[PDB]
Each structure stands twice: as structure tokens, then as C-alpha cells.
Symmetry: C3
Subunit: 278 residues, 3 copies
Amino acid sequence: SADRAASDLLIGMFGSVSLVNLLTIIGCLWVLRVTRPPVSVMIFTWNLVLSQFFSILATMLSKGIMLRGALNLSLCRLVLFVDDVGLYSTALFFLFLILDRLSAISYGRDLWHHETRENAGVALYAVAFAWVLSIVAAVPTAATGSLDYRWLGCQIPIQYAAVDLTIKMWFLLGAPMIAVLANVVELAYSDRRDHVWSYVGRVCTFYVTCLMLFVPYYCFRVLRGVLQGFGIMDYVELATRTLLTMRLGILPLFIIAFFSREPTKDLDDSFDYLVERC
Amino acid sequence: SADRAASDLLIGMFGSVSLVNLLTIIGCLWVLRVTRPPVSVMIFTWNLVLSQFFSILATMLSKGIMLRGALNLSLCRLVLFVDDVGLYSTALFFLFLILDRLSAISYGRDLWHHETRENAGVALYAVAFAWVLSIVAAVPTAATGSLDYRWLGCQIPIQYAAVDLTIKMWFLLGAPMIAVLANVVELAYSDRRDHVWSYVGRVCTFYVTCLMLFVPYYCFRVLRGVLQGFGIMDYVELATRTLLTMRLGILPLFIIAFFSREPTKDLDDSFDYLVERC
Amino acid sequence: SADRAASDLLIGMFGSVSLVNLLTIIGCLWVLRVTRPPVSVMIFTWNLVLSQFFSILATMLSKGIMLRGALNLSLCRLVLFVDDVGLYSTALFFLFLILDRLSAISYGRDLWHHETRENAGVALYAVAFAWVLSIVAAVPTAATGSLDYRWLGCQIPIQYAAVDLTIKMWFLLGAPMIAVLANVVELAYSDRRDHVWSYVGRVCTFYVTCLMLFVPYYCFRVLRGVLQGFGIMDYVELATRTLLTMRLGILPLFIIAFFSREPTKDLDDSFDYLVERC
């Protein structure tokens, strides 16, 4: 049982680091308001922060950091539901933020004085849809969650792993990145192309990061149904599970990366003026 | 069994009301031909009318309004197949009609004399695929239908509720609502933006209406697998199922809402001219 | 067992014919390099050729042309995994090739001297994702493959037919053609429309061919779960399977069809110049 305590400490350390990172993003977003951002960006970025907080909070309860002993089936289903709600919302919020910025930057209207009320209305309507769709997509998982017996956490049973991977694959990489690739391909041959490749390079490394964090875990879960103390098959499950947990500290860093055309330059101006007078 | 008889009356009244509404749309579409619309609109709208008629006809048989006693497994599977064919076709026809009109209105070419043969050819091929995909997508639900024993209808069992919701979610609001949002987001920053917000307001309330009608019934069916005369869990199933039945009287009203840029103004000219001389 | 041997000969003959066709496509692509194509086309077409080779090789092992007797569960799962990897990659590669060429031809920049380094970078990054997604999407198949008993080949059990059709429907005609139809619908109403209808007429017949080759086999497999020596239900399964195997000789013919705007004219110039001097 010594390995279980070590795994509990490692997950808790990652989450505490991730929680500090999220608070830094919240503070960074707060000081970025001086460089007037469009309401569309503000709606998407703030909803991303809320979704990340839900995923971080539910992940620790899923790993049983402090709820060991009281983790029944009712709590296991509720925790797994909240985790996927943040998991699904982040994919949709990032997809809409990328699409909003790709269209805005390409047409040359990405500043505060370049957006209308209708632009803000679409962002609010898109955010409301993404929240509701995430709840609906996470309903099947709330009716199939079960306790973990190798470890002391919460995880969907292996018999539903194939269905779980299919929903996750479409929601995280199937739909969001086919739509992004279709838009980029059309954007690559258009006249509104010169000032979009800096942003396109950011969305390429973002989906690669998402690809290398989500694929190893769910693919292994499906494969464990035929591959059959702890053994080698149990430590690799933990090894591929922490990679999923590291998304709580890497994804929040991409909120600023998609904030504007050159966030690293606007942030310096905002911070320099913040420390000078206000 | 008194409540069951009242259930048939409520569904039967809704179907008769919906049938009257559909006939009004058929008549309204007929009198709208004087304001000669593009062939692309005519192909989509008339195929929608055929799709709605299939859904209305199959829903009455699904509830067992007149087929009680003879509702075996073979008929229940066949009826559930036809009902989902109309359910899937309507989502695809509405998605293609919205996309066709959004592009046509934005570019300023939405009248009869602004379309070519190739525009009509795309609409014909898009309709042909949407009919075939609906048949294919409704094949799995034609091999898993079963008799309902709480009520005297015909519904998919609860063990396939998770799979049923996943297919329905993608078809009704998964693919069509992402594709529409992706186009609208691009349209919000383009020069072809001034005369598209009247139509965008119509597609926003349409998908909200679809969200309010479809989500509660299928989400409850999945949740009923874990929540476990009639009881409270049986009346809420009927309450959340009638909302699905009201789609037969609400969706046909959106056929004219997407007919053109300002259907409420073109309809008045068509009706006023028709009653005068022809 | 006489009919079983005949089926082995028919499938083997189709593969040998398909193998010759693929080698002709490889040779045809090699002689098409004189008419300098963009690197984006070269990346997509060559990756398509590799995917067809995987599908051709795995299909023959799946049918047990020469591996009868040693076809265990481990070999059956591996072969079925490879076949879907080629099957899924072809759908994604064809979708990206169509989208790349539709955008390039519409904007008037489809020649070698009209593409930039960023154009080739997107094609390389899109190909890398399509390979990874195909591997991930084929992972569930490797966990559910089983040995065939009515015949001596490899095929998914009928209990997973519903899940198999859902994944295949989305990958082959669900996502790729919704995105294609959405782009074409917008293209039909734009100014960049005059010189795209020759290509659009080519993607309409291609997807119809995919519709009539993939649908019958998977739709029948789901229906066989309720419809219940060899009988009529076993010969139709063979008849509906050779249509799937026939895709190995039809799909490679579409690699050159999507090569450029008018491949039948560029090929003649390339072949005539090759036989003259070099």
C-alpha cells in the first residue's frame, strides 16, 4: 500500500502546482484588461477558467485525495460527471476561441474597437451551447461510473472503455480539430493569409499537446480488456493516468497563448504600465 | 389504466394538432410560389415537409394510438425505424437549408434570378445524401427496438439508452450546430455581415428550441438506468416524452422561418396578391 | 466447402487486380512529377498510396488467402486493426485532399509556383494527425476482433456490429462529407465559383461511390442480428462483402481524379513528353 500513498502524493502535488498555475492565469487575465480586449475574448477566456477549475476540483476527488473511505457509487458517479463536464467544455471553449480569433485576425478586425454587439452575442450564445452540450455528453458517464479496485480512485469500468474513448476522441480531437483544419486549409489559399501564420503555429502545437496527453490513457484503457500486488500492467496505467492529470497545468497556459495575435508582447506592455502608475 | 387512456388522448390531440399545422405549412408553401423562390429553397423545404409527415405518422404508431394489441416486436422495430428516419432527416435538412440561406443572403444572391443550375444541383445531391444517411443511421435502432411495458407504446430499451443519446446528440445538435456556429463565427468578421444578423437570430432560437425539446427525454432515459401502479419516475418519463412530441408542431413552423430573408413580409405580399385576382 | 474455396479465389483475384491497379497509380503518379505539382498534393497523394497498400495487404490476410490454419485470435485482432487503419486514413486523406484542392482552385492558386512553405506545412501536419487519429479509431477494433466461423476469415462479432457501423459511418461519410458539403454550399454562392464546378462534379461521384460500397456491408451486419450448409443469409453476406473488397480497385483511381483541376489533360502532356525525350 506504500505505492498507493506515493501515487496519492504525486497527484496531489501536481494539482497543487496546477491550482497555483490557474490562479496565475486568473491574475494574468485580470492585468490584461488594460489592453482592451474584445468582449468575445473575455467571454471565452473567463468561461475557460471556470471549466479548468471544475476539472481541477473534480480530478482530486476522483483520485481520492481526501475522500477515501467515503467514496461510494453515488459520489463516484457525481465526481466523474463533473470531471468530464470540465473536460468536454474545455475542448469546445478552446475550439470556439481559436475559430473566433482566426476569423478576427485574418480579416484585420481583432481589437476592441473592431467588434460589434453581434460579435459579443455570438460568443455568449456559443458559450451557453458548449456548457449545455458538455452536460449532455457527460450524462452517459454519470450513469456508468464505478469504484476503482486496483487503486483507491474513481474510474469508468473497462467494459465501457470502448464507448468512453469514442466520445472522448470525437469531442477532444475528432470534431474540434477537423473544423479547425478545414478553416485553416481554406485560410491558407486566401488573400487574408499574411498575418495568420503566427496564430496557426500556436493552434498546431496546442492540438499536438492535447493529442499526446489524452490518447495514451484512453487507448490503453481499451487495450487493457484484451491484454489482461501491482504488476507491470498496473504501473503503466498509473503512468498513463498522470499524463492526463498534467493537462490541468498545461492547458491553462494556452488560454493566454490564444488571447490575441501576440500575447507575449501585449502582456509586457500591460505589466510594465501596471507597475508604473496603475 | 385510466392514466394510459388519458395519455393516448394527449398524444392523439397533439398529433392531430400537429397534422393540421403541417397542412397549413403545405398550403403556405404553395401560396409562396408566386414570390418565386430559388429551386434550392424549394427542394429543401418540400423534402422537410415529407420528412415531417413521416415523423408525425410514425409517432402516432409509436404511441399505439390505433395499433394497440397488434404491436409486436416486428412492428415496433419498423415503427421506431421510420420515426428516427424523419428525426434524422429533419436535422440534416434544416442544417443544409440554414447553410444554403446563410451563404446566399450574405453574398447578396438569394432571389430566383441570382441562382444557377449548379446551385440547384448541389441542393439535389445534398438532399439525396441526407435521406440515405438517415436510413443508415436509423438501421441500428431498427435492430434494437422493443415493446414498452410501463406504458403501451413502443420504445428503445434502457440498456441501449446511452448509445441512443450519443447518436441523437451528434445528429441533432452535435454536427449541425458546430457547423452552423463555425460558419457564423467566420461570418461575424467578414464584409458580408450587414444583412445576415436577421437570419442569424432565427437560427439561434431554432437550435435553442431543438435543445429544449430533445435533450430532456434522452438524458432522462440514460439517467433512469441508475435512478431505478405508476410512480414518480413513470410520470416524469411521460412528461419528458410529450415535449418530444411537441416537436411535430413547432419544427414545421421553422420551415417558413428559414424560407427567405424576411418571410413575414414576403408572405403578406403573396397572400394579398393571391386573394385579389389569382 | 466448394463454395468456400470459390470465395477465396474471387477475393484473391480482386486483390491481385487491385494490386496491379495500385502499382499503375504509383507509376502514374511518378510520371506526373514533370508537370510540377504542389508539395501539398504530393504529400496527400503519396500518403494515400501508402494507406491503400495497408488496406490491400490487410484485406487478403483478413480473408485468409494464405494464413488459413494459423489464424488465431491474436492474428485476427492485429489484421482487423491494420485494415481499419488504412480504411480510416483513406477517408481522412481524401477529405483533406479534396478540401485543399477546392480552396486552391477556387482562389486561382493551384500550380507549383502558387504555393508557399506554409501551404506544405499544413499538409504535412494534417497528414500526421490523420495517421494518428486512424490508429486511435482502430484501437477499439483490435480489442473486439474475433475469428469468423461461417467462413474462414476475420470479422467483428455481430454483437459489436452497431458500434462498428457508427464509427464507420462518421469516419467515411459522416464527418468528411458534412465538411465538404458545407464548403461547397458556401462556394456555390461566392464569386470564386466559375472554375470550381468541374472539381465539384468529381467529389459528388466519388462520395456516391463510397456510399454504395461501404453502406451495404455494415448495414447488413447490424440487420443480421435480428433477421437470424450455407443459406441465403450467408451468400448475401459474401455478396455484400465483395463490394467492400471492390473498394481496393476503385478508390486508387480517384487519387489521380483529385490530383489537379484537369488531370486527364495534364496526364496526356506528361505521358507524351515522357515518351518523346525523357
